[PDB]
Amino acid sequence: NTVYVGNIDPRITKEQLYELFIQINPVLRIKYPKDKVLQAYQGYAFIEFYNQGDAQYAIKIMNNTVRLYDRLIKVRQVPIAKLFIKNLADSIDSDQLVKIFNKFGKLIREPEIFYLSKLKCAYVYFEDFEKADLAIKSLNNQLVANNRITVDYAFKNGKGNAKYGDDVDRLLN
Amino acid sequence: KRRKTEKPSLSQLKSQVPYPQIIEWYDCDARYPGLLASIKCTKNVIPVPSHWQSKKEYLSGRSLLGKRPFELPDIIKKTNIEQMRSTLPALDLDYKKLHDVFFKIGANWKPDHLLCFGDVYYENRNLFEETNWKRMVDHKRPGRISQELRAIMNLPEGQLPPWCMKMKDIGLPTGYPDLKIAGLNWDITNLKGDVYGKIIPNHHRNYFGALISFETPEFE
Amino acid sequence: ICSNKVYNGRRTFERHFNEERHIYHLRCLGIEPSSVFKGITKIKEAQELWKNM
Amino acid sequence: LSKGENVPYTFQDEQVRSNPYIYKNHSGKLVCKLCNTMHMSWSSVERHLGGKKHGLNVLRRGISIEKXXXXXXXXXXXXXXXXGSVGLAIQVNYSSEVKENSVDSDDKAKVPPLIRIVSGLELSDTKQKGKKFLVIAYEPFENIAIELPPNEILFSENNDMDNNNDGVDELNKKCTFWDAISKLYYVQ
RNA sequence: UUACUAAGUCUCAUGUACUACAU
RNA sequence: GUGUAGUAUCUGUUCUUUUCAGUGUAACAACUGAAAUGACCUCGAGGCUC
């Protein structure tokens, strides 16, 4: 629907943008900001079409096409499980963490290693509350690399509430 | 106390409503919320202008600083008193001229903007830009490019826009199926000036009140 | 509906109604976006509201 | 108070300014283009500049500007006992300057053998599993494993007085010895 | 590619208009 | 080109007893009343704490 436009000369005005894009598709709205710190134009606009069909069309045909004031015009189109784990071994690599938690569940992102107190801790992002419950059940208070690690939910107070299972189930759905 | 804590949730109030999106969080403290939802959501009612709950006395507007002092309606500007008396930092006029401007020339004349049934003017709003907007949706049509934007685009005369080539591979605009452009669906020899294409409509009274004559009252 | 999240201002929370994550919670929850659901707070009520939709 | 500087009007289409911010609009008043604030006198202008308001807008504008030979060695397992429980001790022997005479380029040559506890949950064949192995490894020679059915043996409690040279892990420093002069690796 | 909102109250100073009242 | 009384409006400045309950408010705000002292734990936050 709405498309971002950038690399715009502040001398390009609103009527000029409108007359420009009406050549491509019908334009529902144009938001073309006006700086209250420079009293002019900050050189990027937003053109809301009547649908994402004309929007994407204008993205395809318009991108890297029109040359305005010698500068080219750019167009660009415009919640997970988290486990805190404490007392990790210094020999535990982030990739090793990835290998350890892959068997329990798919990771939406990579673990985050940080130090509290000296105290090696990490945040592990699971795509599933139930697979997170698996890594908890098996890995809680366990000895890896000759070091006892604790696996629980990271704080937001901590994850794993009743509404959390309900909505995380939906985000899975 | 108890009455303040007795209030139903706004979402509990939404279900009673056929148009639930108008109701807002403050409607929870409506002393008669089930009724106020029915009135506020009734067909033709026009919700209260929202400048209430602001203490700014409805105009603090920064935009108010930059508003134009005034502009004569062009029909009255024809009367030339603009030059006769300088309002910005004696002019003998004709009775027939002024009278005809209001009546002969300006009978059918009407302000271009006005407003609609439910139009309400909020502080930050300025009608003028929307007037040039509505007038511009009128004048400007696809296939035509003014000489100013053409010069900025650096497109010389007789040459097609750069999106005609990508429009050759991608195809005509989905929004304009009837659009014609020289060199592709439309005759290149008809390329003239600022118009490289035009929409060809495929579609091809008296309103019981047709006056069939127009006669204004004469001053003399 | 958002992580039982805390907000320090009413203007800000009124801005939460149009946001990436808030709409992600709605739409991924099965409650479709935009302007009917704006006044949402708890996850429960908007479920019956969406059944009304 | 103006210090003799000339502030050009906003419409005069910009000599370098002290602060390229305070201007005079079409009218005679003085304005801060960033702050969009009107100021009656140059004293009010200086109050604006010395005020936190203008500064915040300056920081916001700056933010806008930024925007393997595999050879099986010889192990010597032996049931040990001390006090107060039972522990295992292994005696692994290595080559007698037979083949290590061709490789001496200080390439991890100083690195002693290393041990790790591996779960059988992962094997090249993946058939049966459910027990641990006390794997011992050295660069040239082939790896070696020892099955540990007992959930825990000799797993001590603060043996030494908490000294922190992790080496590889608590296991290695805690309970291993590398007689490098004779090439004998003891583990218990 | 930055998807458009900030001042308020108090205090002690400066800026500017004004209202009755007297030579 | 003055004086007496008085008013409005900028701008600068700055954040007033941590909490609880009542009034009040569209919600705030504001107003009205009281007052914890001690110990401990993790990274100003947190306590089915005593």
UniProtKB/Swiss-Prot annotation, chain A:
Signal peptide, first to last residue: none
UniProt xrefs under SUPFAM superfamilies: RNA-binding domain, RBD
Superkingdom of source: Eukaryota
One record GO biological process: mRNA splicing, via spliceosome
Residue ranges annotated for the RRM domain, each copy included: 1-78, 81-156
Sample GO molecular function, one term: RNA binding
General remark: Present with 1240 molecules/cell in log phase SD medium.
Protein's name in the database: Protein HSH49
Organism whose genome encodes this protein: Saccharomyces cerevisiae (strain ATCC 204508 / S288c)
Curated annotation (Swiss-Prot), chain B:
Subcellular location: Nucleus
Source species, domain of life: Eukaryota
Major localization listed first in the record, in broad terms: nucleus
Disulfide bonds: none
Keyword flag Cell division: no
Keywords on record: mRNA processing, Nucleus, Phosphoprotein, RNA-binding
Phenotype upon changing residue 57 to K: In allele CUS1-54; cold-sensitive growth suppressor
Function: Essential splicing protein required for U2 snRNP binding to pre-mRNA during spliceosome assembly.
Entry similarity comment: To mammalian SAP 145. Some, to C.elegans ZK632.11.
Protein known as: Cold sensitive U2 snRNA suppressor 1
Organism encoding this protein: Saccharomyces cerevisiae (strain ATCC 204508 / S288c)
Gene that specifies this protein: CUS1
Segment of the intact protein contained: 125 to 376 of 436
Swiss-Prot record, chain C:
Location of this chain's protein in the cell: Nucleus
ZnF endpoints (Matrin-type): 1-28
Top-rank taxon, per record: Eukaryota
UniProt function note: mRNA splicing factors, PRP9, PRP11, and PRP21, are necessary for binding of the U2 snRNP to the pre-mRNA in an early step of spliceosome assembly.
Miscellaneous comment as given in the Swiss-Prot or TrEMBL entry: Present with 3920 molecules/cell in log phase SD medium.
Similarity comment: family membership: Belongs to the SF3A3 family.
Subunit-level organization: Belongs to the CWC complex (or CEF1-associated complex), a spliceosome sub-complex reminiscent of a late-stage spliceosome composed of the U2, U5 and U6 snRNAs and at least BUD13, BUD31, BRR2, CDC40, CEF1, CLF1, CUS1, CWC2, CWC15, CWC21, CWC22, CWC23, CWC24, CWC25, CWC27, ECM2, HSH155, IST3, ISY1, LEA1, MSL1, NTC20, PRP8, PRP9, PRP11, PRP19, PRP21, PRP22, PRP45, PRP46, SLU7, SMB1, SMD1, SMD2, SMD3, SMX2, SMX3, SNT309, SNU114, SPP2, SYF1, SYF2, RSE1 and YJU2.
Entry protein name: Pre-mRNA-splicing factor PRP9
Gene this chain is encoded by: PRP9
Included stretch of the parent chain: 425 to 477 of 530
From Swiss-Prot, chain D:
Keyword annotations from UniProtKB, A to Z: Metal-binding, mRNA processing, mRNA splicing, Nucleus, Spliceosome, Zinc, Zinc-finger
The keyword DNA repair appears for this protein: no
GO cellular component, as recorded: catalytic step 2 spliceosome; nucleus; Prp19 complex; spliceosomal complex; U2 snRNP; U2-type prespliceosome
Record-level GO BP terms: mRNA splicing, via spliceosome; spliceosomal complex assembly; U2-type prespliceosome assembly
Molecular function in Gene Ontology: RNA binding; zinc ion binding
Zn finger limits (Matrin-type): 30-60
Subcellular localization: Nucleus
Family membership: Belongs to the SF3A2 family.
Protein function: mRNA splicing factors, PRP9, PRP11, and PRP21, are necessary for addition of the U2 snRNP to the pre-mRNA in an early step of spliceosome assembly.
Oligomer status and interactors: Belongs to the CWC complex (or CEF1-associated complex), a spliceosome sub-complex reminiscent of a late-stage spliceosome composed of the U2, U5 and U6 snRNAs and at least BUD13, BUD31, BRR2, CDC40, CEF1, CLF1, CUS1, CWC2, CWC15, CWC21, CWC22, CWC23, CWC24, CWC25, CWC27, ECM2, HSH155, IST3, ISY1, LEA1, MSL1, NTC20, PRP8, PRP9, PRP11, PRP19, PRP21, PRP22, PRP45, PRP46, SLU7, SMB1, SMD1, SMD2, SMD3, SMX2, SMX3, SNT309, SNU114, SPP2, SYF1, SYF2, RSE1 and YJU2. Interacts with CUS2.
Other information: Present with 3460 molecules/cell in log phase SD medium.
Protein name (Swiss-Prot/TrEMBL): Pre-mRNA-splicing factor PRP11
Species per Swiss-Prot/TrEMBL record: Saccharomyces cerevisiae (strain ATCC 204508 / S288c)
Taxonomic lineage: Eukaryota, Fungi, Dikarya, Ascomycota, Saccharomycotina
From-to range in the entire protein, with total length: 34 to 253 of 266
